Amino acid sequence: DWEIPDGQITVGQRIGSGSFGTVYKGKWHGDVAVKMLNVTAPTPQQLQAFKNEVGVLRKTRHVNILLFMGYSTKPQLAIVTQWCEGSSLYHHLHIIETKFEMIKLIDIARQTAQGMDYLHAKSIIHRDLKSNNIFLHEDLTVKIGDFGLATVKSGSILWMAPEVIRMQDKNPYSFQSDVYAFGIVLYELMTGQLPYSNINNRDQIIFMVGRGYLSPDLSKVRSNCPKAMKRLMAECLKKKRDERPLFPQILASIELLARSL
Amino acid sequence: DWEIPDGQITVGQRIGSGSFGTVYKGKWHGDVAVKMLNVTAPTPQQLQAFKNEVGVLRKTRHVNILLFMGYSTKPQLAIVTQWCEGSSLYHHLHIIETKFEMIKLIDIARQTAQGMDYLHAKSIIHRDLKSNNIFLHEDLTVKIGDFGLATVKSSGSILWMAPEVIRMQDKNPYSFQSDVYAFGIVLYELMTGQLPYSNINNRDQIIFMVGRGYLSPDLSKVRSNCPKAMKRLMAECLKKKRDERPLFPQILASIELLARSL
Numbered sequence: 001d002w003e004i005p006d007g008q009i010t011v012g013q014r015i016g017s018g019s020f021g022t023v024y025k026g027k028w029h030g031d032v033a034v035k036m037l038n039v040t041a042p043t044p045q046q047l048q049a050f051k052n053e054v055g056v057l058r059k060t061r062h063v064n065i066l067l068f069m070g071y072s073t074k075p076q077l078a079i080v081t082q083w084c085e086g087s088s089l090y091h092h093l094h095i096i097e098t099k100f101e102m103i104k105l106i107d108i109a110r111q112t113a114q115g116m117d118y119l120h121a122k123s124i125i126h127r128d129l130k131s132n133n134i135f136l137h138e139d140l141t142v143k144i145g146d147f148g149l150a151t152v153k154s155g156s157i158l159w160m161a162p163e164v165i166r167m168q169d170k171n172p173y174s175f176q177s178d179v180y181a182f183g184i185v186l187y188e189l190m191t192g193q194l195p196y197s198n199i200n201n202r203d204q205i206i207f208m209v210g211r212g213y214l215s216p217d218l219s220k221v222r223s224n225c226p227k228a229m230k231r232l233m234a235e236c237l238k239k240k241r242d243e244r245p246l247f248p249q250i251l252a253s254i255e256l257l258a259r260s261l
Numbered sequence: 262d263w264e265i266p267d268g269q270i271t272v273g274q275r276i277g278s279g280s281f282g283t284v285y286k287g288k289w290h291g292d293v294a295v296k297m298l299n300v301t302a303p304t305p306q307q308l309q310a311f312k313n314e315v316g317v318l319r320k321t322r323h324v325n326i327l328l329f330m331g332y333s334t335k336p337q338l339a340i341v342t343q344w345c346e347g348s349s350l351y352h353h354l355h356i357i358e359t360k361f362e363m364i365k366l367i368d369i370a371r372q373t374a375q376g377m378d379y380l381h382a383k384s385i386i387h388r389d390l391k392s393n394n395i396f397l398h399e400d401l402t403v404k405i406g407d408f409g410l411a412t413v414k415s416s417g418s419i420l421w422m423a424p425e426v427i428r429m430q431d432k433n434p435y436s437f438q439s440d441v442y443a444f445g446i447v448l449y450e451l452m453t454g455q456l457p458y459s460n461i462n463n464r465d466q467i468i469f470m471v472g473r474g475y476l477s478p479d480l481s482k483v484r485s486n487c488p489k490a491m492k493r494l495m496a497e498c499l500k501k502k503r504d505e506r507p508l509f510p511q512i513l514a515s516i517e518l519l520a521r522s523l
């Protein structure tokens with residue numbers, strides 16, 4: 001089992017928030033990340049998420065997926081993963097303006113696909129892939145996290161495929177919803193910025209993207225962005241679910257992109 | 262469940278030998294290390310070794326334990342882990358005589374203790390700790406592996422073998438403290454860049470002597486910048502008497518203090 005008996009985890013500093021709780025740095029057999037639900041009496045629903053996420057996380061063992069290390073139910077519900085030195089992709093790209101070399105950008109991308117291919121072969125849909133959820137350990141290895149909105153067969157507007165934004169379908173979530181999210185992550189990597197920067201109105205972005213009036217301006221990729229890469233982005237950011245590639249194909253594509261650079 | 266269906270693992274190069282098998286680089290959701298038993302008809306002793314090692318690795322999820330990813334039963338019996346770009350600590354210290362800095366050597370020791378602490382807490386005895394089984398993922402992160410010989414409470418790798426393990430006279434010759442002696446030898450390698458008993462060329466004699474207590478690692482050979490507390494820890498972990506050796510909670514703290522003062 002992976003239940004860490006109450007008292008073993010040492011909760012240090014509050015880092016931020018996760019799918020269904022607050023993230024703190026912690027100590028359990030070393031440095032760990034701790035995602036804790038702070039309520040005293042967990043709501044049945046809340047408890048449900050914990051169980052789901054944990055059940056989802058028990059089925060992951062991959063270099064590019066945040067290593068779930070265990071869980072805790074008392075004093076409070078908590079999810080313990082490894083600790084990633086550095087920050088999330090969102091942070092690197094949009095807060096501290098880390099300027100990565102293009103070959104490093106393609107590496108980050110390939111790794112994210114490596115992890116997402118893993119997830120999909122396992123019938124896991126992340127349902128909330130964003131830069132905020134892609135952590136770069138030792139500014140080298142990409143690990144994906146926050147698997148609470150995940151599931152097995154948001155406020156994250158910018159990564160949401162138009163059929164998800166529309167929400168006018170049944171589980172508008174698909175391996176392609178994830179693929180679109182990933183394609184937006186690709187935009188961020190090769191643009192250095194967030195989609196739709198020239199619009200200041202969240203509602204407006206939401207509507208247009210949902211009705212297909214708005215799309216990421218791929219004309220902003222850096223000059224060094226392999227064209228193949230621009231074309232792959234386009235394939236992933238297609239406004240029609242079935243016109244988008246799955247992760248084995250995306251992986252094969254990026255790896256070829258790598259052979260020549 | 263961790264069974265990987267037939268056909269999904271792509272076996273690449275032969276990388277070397279494992280405890281009960283042959284290690285290859287491979288591909289399964291990315292670069293993976295694969296250890297395969299290269300036999301046609303697997304005896305029940307090897308099927309037992311396999312079910313044992315799978316059972317232990319399932320319980321390991323720690324940055325300093327080599328990431329188990331899954332097992333296959335066809336084409337062959339196999340264990341699949343993450344792929345560690347770099348090489349074993351042994352390779353670095355004795356093959357390419359890599360020159361890590363003390364700060365790094367201490368960090369490598371901290372991480373190996375971190376990994377060792379994780380296992381011993383889940384009641385796992387590694388039973389074959391050695392530089393050969395410590396891999397340097399990106400020359401940064403220590404990943405401990407080869408849990409073939411490992412077991413859960415209730416070889417030919419002599420230099421890491423505690424005296425009582427060499428003798429095989431006591432019951433349960435192996436114990437948390439056997440792996441602490443193994444760790445003590447790994448500390449030695451880190452602090453001398455060297456193998457113990459490097460001036461003796463007879464395996465049988467080294468076995469006998471360490472077994473009787475005639476022989477022990479020369480500690481005056483630690484590098485002159487090795488902190489006094491790291492040498493003191495090294496010798497605590499290397500005490501001939503099993504129960505006079507620390508456990509990894511004490512060991513980790515010690516190193517973590519050494520750190521603060523460096």
Ligand SMILES: OCCn1cc(-c2ccc3c(c2)CC/C3=N\O)c(-c2ccncc2)n1
Nearest residue numbers: 016018023033035079081083084145146147
């Ligand atoms: O983006 C906000 C900052 N931030 C949030 C997390 C985080 C998010 C989700 C989850 C965990 C940690 C652990 C449990 C979990 N759910 O999977 C991290 C983090 C992740 C890994 N190592 C270090 C830090 N940073």
Ligand SMILES: OCCn1cc(-c2ccc3c(c2)CC/C3=N\O)c(-c2ccncc2)n1
Nearest residue numbers: 277279284294295296340342344345407408
């Ligand atoms: O020592 C000879 C060289 N060598 C052996 C391994 C090895 C050893 C044992 C086991 C595995 C791989 C995989 C399964 C296993 N048993 O747990 C490795 C290695 C480990 C991790 N990443 C890259 C290489 N190098």
Ligand SMILES: [Cl-]
Nearest residue numbers: 058059319322
């Ligand atoms: Cl597991």
Ligand SMILES: [Cl-]
Nearest residue numbers: 434435436439
């Ligand atoms: Cl012992």
